[PDB]
Structure 1
C-alpha cells in the first residue's frame, strides 16, 4: 500500500521521468542548476550581511545613558506640572513615555493628572493641537 520507507515514488514523479528518453536527465539537470542558483544567492546575501555587520561594529555602547533610579513621589512640584504639559504636547496619550520624562510619577498618577488639571491646563486643546502631528 506504501513504498518501502525512504523510497520516494509518487505517481506524479514517475510519468515525469518517463515522458521521453532524456526526460529523466532533463528533470535532474534543472534541479542541479536550481541548486547552484540558490547556492550563489546564499553567498551573495552572506556577503551583504557581512558588510552590514561591519557597519554596526561596536553596537551602541558609546551612546547609552546611565540609569536614573528614582522613587515615585506623590506631590506635583510646579516644575513637574510644567514638564507634564510639554510632555503631553509632544507625546499625546503615551503615558508611559510621559512618566519616563517626569521621572518620579507613575502612569496612574499621570493618568489621574489629565483628569485633575484638565481645565486649568487646557489639556483638551493641548491634545487637540498635538493631533495635528
Structure 2
C-alpha cells in the first residue's frame, strides 16, 4: 500500500534517478549546488540585516514624547474650536487624529462638532480643500 516509514519513493522520482547511467549523481549534484546557492545567500542577507540593525541602534528613545493624561472636557473654548478647524484642513475625516490634536475632546464630540458648527465654519469648503491634496 505505502512505503515503509522513514523511507521516501514516488513513481515520479524513480523514473528520474534511472533515465540514464548517471541521472543519479546528476540529480544529487543539482541539489548539492542548489543548497550551497541558498546557504551562501542566507549569509548575504544575514550580512545585510546585520548592518541595517546597527543603523537602528539607539532605538527611538531620544525622540519619545512624555504622557499627556488630560481629562476629556465638555466645553468648546474658542481656542479649541480653532485648533479643530485647522486640524480638519489637515486631517479631513480622521476624527481620531483630530481628537488627539485638541487633546480634550472625545472622538465623537469631534463628529458632533462636525455637525454643530457645520455651516458657521464652512466645513464643506474646509473638507473639499483637504481633498484637493
**Same fold at TM > 0.5:** yes
- Alignment map for 1:50-89 (pairs within 5 Å): 50-89=50-89
Deviation at 1:113, TM superposition (A): 0.3
Runs ≥4 residues deviating over 3 A: none
Deviations 1:55-104 (A, max 9, x none): 01011000010010000000000000000000000000000000000000
* TM-align CA RMSD: 0.4
Deviations 1:98-123 (A, max 9, x none): 00000000011001001000000000
Aligned to 1:93, the other structure's residue is in SS state coil
Aligned to 2:104, the other structure's residue is in SS state coil
Point out where structure 1 has 5 or more consecutive residues left out of the alignment: none
Aligned to 2:105, the other structure's residue is in SS state coil
Aligned to 1:13, the other structure's residue is in SS state helix
Give the TM-score normalised by the residue count of structure 1.
0.99
Q: Find the counterpart in structure 2 of residue 114 from structure 1.
A: 114
Deviation at 1:32, TM superposition (A): 0.2
Deviation at 1:6, TM superposition (A): 1.3
Aligned length: 133
Give the TM-score normalised by the residue count of structure 2.
0.99
